[model samples]
Target: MASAVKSLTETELLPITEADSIPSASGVYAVYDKSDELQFVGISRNIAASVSAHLKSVPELCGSVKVGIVEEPDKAVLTQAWKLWIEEHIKVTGKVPPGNKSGNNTFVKVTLEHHHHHH
Candidate 1:
């Protein structure tokens, strides 16, 4: 099952510079390093603000990171999506990214966290 993955639709990848352009809406977002690895997965009520906070913490990634947004309304569904995304990424990559700290994201409610990543 390591190869199995959930195909994401209507996902838009954007550069950190365009963080302001992400609509101020509810959604799940993924952060990527310059190596194009999944640095983190998250769900936020204010995507625009969350992205900005993330960018601030990893200023080096301002030029090196890319963001992908998947708008999801139901908070519970969004939480599952965030955790599922992290799980699938590990299955694909065979190891968690440098930033992800758990097998599954533990702290729920899916808001910004210390170190500025994950749901």
Candidate 2:
């Protein structure tokens, strides 16, 4: 299934301008579900755009998606942190995190190995 299936609802999707109000140098984000459960943990270069895309592509999740941007060191570090958080939740729960169609094993991998090396 497409990751868009796990997209958030309109109410859940916060605008980047609002997120930018917070002091965040890097890209760290939190995604919560309808019940306020921390379902998807992610990091991106652009939190606002990322969140917006999630909601736009997957309107179903709009009502359940809540975002919080973390101001930290950098994108790499923030990504690592989010990964760790997600992994830890999985390790403890056994069940895959919710709103994570793309983050699961069922996800199809699309690798563009050499975009510049077109034949």
Candidate 3:
């Protein structure tokens, strides 16, 4: 065993149909198309709610989803995980996931619930 990282690909992909199965907790999630290529990465205080929004916007890109639940509702920590996975995806594809880059097209504006946390 040598520096094995828990890769995004290694995470189980919950089919889009099973979106309801996801818990409405803070989490970072990655979405992939049917080809298993990463199409999006996002973070939310309510993962199920955010994903369900995406469902209506880009159904094709949401063939499956992989997620990591954050025990604490900390934006810094949640954002860190979200950024890491996006970087991991870039290392493999040398491109931002289209769903993230092309919001004008197959993308929809997903609004995160305002945390309104003061420093």
Candidate 4:
């Protein structure tokens, strides 16, 4: 029965300019840069929370997000969906998303510009 469901890439890509719009549910999500390049793909129990954190950590790279909700609530299923999404991305792009790569990061991580004043 599971073979007929839509995959992660089949889902719609929602703009991340408003992070709150993403549903805070169990699912897999992908983030893209402003230039429409895929930047990261990940699974989360709370997709909104995770995505919001990314928005906080790397504001520039999060131009939009695509989500695939896993209704089963199974960790293995969630993980499998994540893997498939990554594999699909690799198959299409010939490389893993920059944020998923280890060591040297292609995207920059910046702290919140709190704009604090010091004496």
Candidate 5:
């Protein structure tokens, strides 16, 4: 069975801008510890800023993380993609994606809320 893992202490999770060209559109991202264990998975409107926030908030918490941008910024696609990506990664790697505590589907609702609020 997969295990829920924490971040690593040796290396640090850096800003996405310093590393690669992240898409400006909405997407989902994952954080992995040094041992390549998945730590956290989340969706964001701005992936670059999201990565920066993770680094700042977590600090030396993840060794590496992956950011996957969905085709468009639509909420349904983003949420489905987020869930699919998380499930796929966990199934392949045998690592449980971190919980937000608010709940499994909370972020999706939050995303939609912001979208509706803006539009």
Candidate 6:
């Protein structure tokens, strides 16, 4: 008999400015500034929609941002992980990260488009 192994969700990191670049699946994301790192973590059922929700507050948080996406089936799991990551880092550093104090908003609406004709 063979044993089943466990695997964590895997996602890709991409520049936030690039449009039409996020995964279509559900996920959690970690946003970081150019230097300070770990600014915010956002989540949504549709990964593509999550980015839009962040930009509203992104510029106010910091410029020169990079993001990490963890595409998973469950947002609750992602959210808990995100929180734990922050808490662990804070437990060690004893200070909030760049945007940890900032509010995190998630996906509310996203439009999916289908093209009837190839162009």
Candidate 6, residues 1-119, lDDT tens digits: the string is 01110111233345556636755555455554555455555555665556655554344433322233444455566676566655544565554643445432222322332323458
Give TM-scores for every candidate, taking all chains together and pairing residue i with residue i.
0.63, 0.47, 0.74, 0.74, 0.58, 0.51
RMSD of 2: 10.1
Give the Cα-based TM-score of candidate 1 against the true structure: 0.63
Residue pairs in clash, model 5: none
RMSD (CA, Å), each prediction: 7.7, 10.1, 7.6, 5.6, 10.2, 10.6
Q: Please say which candidate is ahead in lDDT: 3 or 6.
A: 3
15-104 in candidate 5: lDDT tens per residue?
A: 333545544546666666567666567778887676665554455444666666556557776676566656665677655633543445
Residue 11, candidate 6: alpha-carbon lDDT: 31
lDDT of each: 0.57, 0.45, 0.70, 0.70, 0.54, 0.46
Better of 2 and 5 by TM-score: 5
Mark the regions of model 4 whose C-alpha exceeds 4 Å error after superposition.
1-6, 102-119
Screening candidate 3 with a backbone cut-off below 3 angstroms (N, C-alpha, C), the clashing residue pairs are none
TM-score of candidate 5 on Cα atoms, chains taken together: 0.58
Q: Model 3 off-target regions past 4 Å?
A: 1-10, 102-119
Task: Give the per-residue lDDT of model 2 (tens digit) for 1-119.
Answer: 11111222211244333444432323545555445445556666665666655545444433343443444445555656566656655676643553555533211121323324357
**Model 6 CA deviation exceeding 4 Å by range:** 1-11, 60-72, 88-119
Cα lDDT for residue 28, model 3?
79
Judging by lDDT, tell me the better candidate of 3 and 5. 3
Clashes of each: 0, 7, 0, 0, 0, 0
| Cα TM-score of candidate 6 | 0.51
